[PDB]
Amino acid sequence: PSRFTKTRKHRGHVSAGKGRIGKHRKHPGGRGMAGGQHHHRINMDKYHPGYFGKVGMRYFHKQQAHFWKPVLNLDKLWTLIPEDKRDQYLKSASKETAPVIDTLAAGYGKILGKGRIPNVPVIVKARFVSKLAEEKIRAAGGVVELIA
């Protein structure tokens, strides 16, 4: 609100906290982003290095859809099973009945392998995997299956 702003305090002080020498003039340095290679070039080197120039290839008519591939670590992995069913499968497992975990149906494109799972067989259905994440599921007892 307006009664807390500092323009209430400056009432009765001539310059409004802008100075007598310099004053508050229209657009002293230039409007917007002017003189970024000239009279503002020190501010643009430190704070914004890389700004000027251009780099890699172009890509005409790109589509954010072709590159959809949201990742999932082995840490989370078990969170894709409902919470009531989770303790059943953990305690006393075997090769007869392991839980299927559909990662595409939950909304993930790749299975990265960030850190450690309990020693229980599982089945993991996924579009992509990394080399290392496949090794840990094998090690515990489970396997991977590829789909589209």
């Binding site: 392991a98 299927v100 089945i123 995997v129 496949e134 489970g142 299956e145």
Partner: peptide
Amino acid sequence: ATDVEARAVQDNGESAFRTL
């Protein structure tokens, strides 16, 4: 609902990552 909950464990041994 395409796939079932409880299933057995088959292991053929081509490592998935080698396939891809």
